[model samples]
Target chain A: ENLDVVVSLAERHYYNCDFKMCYKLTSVVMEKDPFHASCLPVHIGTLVELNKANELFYLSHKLVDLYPSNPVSWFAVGCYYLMVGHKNEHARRYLSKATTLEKTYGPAWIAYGHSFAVESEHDQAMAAYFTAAQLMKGCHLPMLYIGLEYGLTNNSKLAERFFSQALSIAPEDPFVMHEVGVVAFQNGEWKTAEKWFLDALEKIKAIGNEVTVDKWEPLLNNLGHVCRKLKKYAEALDYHRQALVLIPQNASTYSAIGYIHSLMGNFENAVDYFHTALGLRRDDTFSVTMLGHCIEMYIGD
Target chain B: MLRRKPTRLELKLDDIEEFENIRKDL
Candidate 1:
């Protein structure tokens, strides 16, 4: 049957992350049976994953036309629009409709909170996230985002508690590990920071996901800084060197290496590293500051 | 009236269900 062939192809593509192909195959099904309520959600979800916002919207609208009473379809439309950077007003409209239709979709509440966060309505964002958390206890990401909002407002204790709670739930999450490491680094717990970074690096390697250079680069630089503070100059140098391999043009990594060399009393090499950093990023404030310190250490003034 | 063998529409519908089932497994 045509339906069997389309389904087979869609399944093949979905597992491969070929979302566009999945959407096309799903669309064939939708076109054949526009009134099939069961197909509506899958097609909308596939289109959203494919970043086909316009098509998702159209398909969702069609589903609503076919069956006016399904709140889930409206929620799907809202979520798709919110995620794909569509008109915020439309996102709000559909999300509000979803809530009106079904008052207790915890995921929909979390998504609406995300939209408020995007709009810089922090109080509303917090309230929405809180409601979602209350509705769906043990949802770590909403709790973590709430903690991030608190941290941004300098409520470090609350931030630490929430982030710790998230860590308890998903201890091996790299992003959570990174956050804990940052907080430790901020509070002068350099050894704790180093441990967390090492844990995060191991997790990344084990997962075998292609690491984004920008993200891993900062973590490496942070590890190097913490290692230097802990008087582990060789370890510090190794971290810095790895970071340099990932992002050779980063001025901060160069400055970090330079600082490690200075700590090891290698003034000549420290100056060389500092100059290389300065060459890449002329206005690198940290390198400029370290270069001054390096010069003072070597030049007797 | 005897139903004719499956139309293009019916075949496509069957495929859609097959696809949905596969996704559910995932």
Candidate 2:
């Protein structure tokens, strides 16, 4: 019974797209019984998703001898191949074996979907995503997969529906809110996108103080972009400065502040900012191109 | 000085899938 419910809960969180929380929860199980081979896939899946390469590197070494017949050993190894190996066909083989080894392993199915996703095998990927979604209700990742896959393929109507589905299920999810913001961003709905970004930031704060502004510069950056578009130059400048502080040497953010200066007729400052951007990243074509414009104006007077 | 990469905030839609969600019931 402990194994029954716990695995499902971990997988639910994983599929709901909470890798960190899944990591937190699965680590608890690992402390109690590292050899719970069936749950190892969930543990490995969360770890891999969270990008804990060091822990996974060590864990995969111990798996085979510990659970010779375990599907998770294969699955864990499969993540390495998928993430680091860059060898998709082989990853599919390993993940497929993992599914065969344990038919009900939810993450295995999602991994199988990912194998297909990376390879652009849309039909199979959709099939796997649907199965993962079927096996996982109340959790929302598979549905989000459908939204993202179809959305990127230019099926906005379909994508919009799935996005709403994920939002309805996880209203306070900062990530989900951000997903909504990104959609509006792509669709050019700045005001609505701004709201979502703000909400996402608030949710991140609620998650805890452990969340740093560096980890959330995108929200600030995107929100700043929206304000700039709205022609609220002062507000845009403020947000950009806030984001830029978290990453002072960021070329693009520096260029952004320069752009605000240019908009406000401060061509001298724009020239200076663009130079700073160019110093950080010489290949920044955007800053390079803007550099000429700034120079032309700066020398005009 | 340790070569710490200056992290910038860029939104990658694919990566966004990893970082998302809060469920009160869970």
Candidate 3:
């Protein structure tokens, strides 16, 4: 039980961006159960991530020799190659050896993907991302990346294919707020984008106000835009108002709320808001045009 | 499986339960 707790703690620290604690917790776990099936690779992985070349080179050489047929052994060697500059090819080769020995090793497969990604080998990176996605079932990371790469390359179909896959795997962790929402918005799926942002706000509602609101402040603006697309004027106004409370000085925010008031036929309020929006940046052409419309509507009223 | 434990290495081994546990523990 202690073994489980310690290694879990170490891995927790690792993902939390606390390599120091990961190093500390994992070292103790390794000393306690050196023969642990899981701990060994995690230990090696932590060492590799920590840039402990002295310790890794020392351990990896021993492990590869002792378990030449083992996947982790090969993975360790691969990690070393990756750690050493200009050895990406060697890293890929060694990680490939690891994957061959154990077709289902997710970490090795991910490392294999990284080797290609670092080299800017786009095709290989895509291939590895798909492979890793398959092996690590329910892992949104590789799926998200596959989508992101396709998105970055301006390949609409491929990006949408992977984005849908990533969306399927995306959980309700609220981290999906920005990622899924942005992706869906880009793909012109207002409904899908709306759901992610709403879910994120719901999840984080009871969490940290300062740190959480810092991010969700802008995120609320996105949600407001989506609501506007869906014709949910009241909800859109609420979201925008919430964002404005946290981030007060955004001209875009001023412009958006003005547009909402115009849509609701509150032309006088719209003109007032638009006046401020245009005042913030005189050269915002869209704001200028919208301001004209609002003023004319108000005058007609 | 390699039984040799390198002195002063920095890393950990796998635990299936932890891998399975999906809650944020960090």
Candidate 4:
């Protein structure tokens, strides 16, 4: 009885993108009921999000052995394979079997889509995501994934349509909001993109009062990009610096910061940041070009 | 169920007969 409540609570945490809290809550339930059918999907998803590959392997094996007919069993096995990396084909084999066993199984369909997406097979990924979208009408994740696929292929119009649908369903989801902003940014609607990205950042802030997830580093960097386009260089620098805080060695963030410094006429600071970017990624063409430009300007000044 | 246009080949009586013919040829 109490386990059901805890599982639902954990599921809520998962939906809210608070994977850490979800992991802790699911962990508590796992100790009591190792294969609680209601909890297994959420727990397995949590394991995948947290990158607990060893735990997932152990759990997936047990689930498959005990419940060979269950779709969640194969879903666990598939998720584990996907998590271990470079095994998209093996992941697809199991995930496809899971979907065949129960075509309405949304999670397996999403994972199947991911297997294709990881390999840049956009057509195959969209086909799988379309199946999930129909099966999981109440879930925003399918819409979000479809929009991401459209965005990847540079179809901003379709991307915006799907992202808007996703945001309507998951208004508080920062990921959806970020995707909406991405489409706007692609359309060169800088002001609209800035509003959506800021709203996403604010929503994330309200979730945990701090941004710690490495996945969100892109959002911060994107914010920096839009701010620069708006000629808000100081704000852009702040955003890029915040992105640096999340991922210290990201060469792209260093290069972005260097670009902003050059725009602001701080040639000395630009040279230093570009040098750091090159130190991190020795073959960053943009950084090399910017570094050369900044050194010439520094000498002339 | 949401109905959309079919994209994959669907089996029909003609397809079944063709399969049999191919099998006989093999």
Estimated TM-score per prediction? 0.54, 0.71, 0.48, 0.78
TM-score of model 3 relative to the true fold?
0.48
Model 2, A1-301: lDDT tens digits are 3655777677666545555676777787788888776567678766665566778778876786677577777677777676666677887898788788877766667777877876778889878888877766766667767776675577778988987898788665566666667667666676787797887777666553344443236667777777766668789888888877776767778877787676666777777887888889787666666567666655767
Best by lDDT: 4
Model 1: per-residue Cα lDDT over A1-301, one tens digit each:
4575666566545433345567678878867875544444456545554456677667666666766677766767676677565588787788778777777766567767777777778888788788778765854767776776676567779989998897787665665676667666666576787887888777656552444342235677667767766778787788779877987787777767776666666778988988998798797666666567566656774
Q: Give the DockQ of candidate 1.
A: 0.01
* Stronger candidate by lDDT (1 vs 3): 3
Question: By the TM-score metric, which is better: model 1 or model 4?
Answer: 4
Chain A vs. true chain A, TM-score per candidate?
0.58, 0.75, 0.51, 0.84
Q: Candidate order by TM-score, highest to lowest?
A: 4, 2, 1, 3
Model 1 error, position A180 (Å): 1.2
After superposition, the stretches of candidate 1 with alpha carbons farther than 4 Å from their true spots are A1-138, A148-156, A207-216, A296-301, B1-26
DockQ of each: 0.01, 0.05, 0.01, 0.01
The digit string of per-residue lDDT tens for model 4 on B1-26 reads 01111011111222123223433675
Best by DockQ: 2
RMSD of 2: 9.4
TM-score per model for chain B alone?
A: 0.35, 0.20, 0.23, 0.34
Model 3 per-residue lDDT tens digits across residues A1-301: 5578777677554433344567788778777876565777677766765568889898878887777876877778887777664777788888889888888887687778777776668788778878887776765657666665575466667766765765564443344345556666656687887887776666656432224342125677777777766768788888778777987887777777777776666777877887897778676565566566556655766
Q: Candidate 2: misplaced stretches above 4 Å?
A: A1-24, A35-38, A45-51, A64-69, A77-131, A134-138, A207-209, A212-216, A245-249, B1-26
Task: Give the CA lDDT, 0 to 100, for residue A291 in model 4.
Answer: 64
For candidate 4, the per-residue lDDT at A246 reads 83
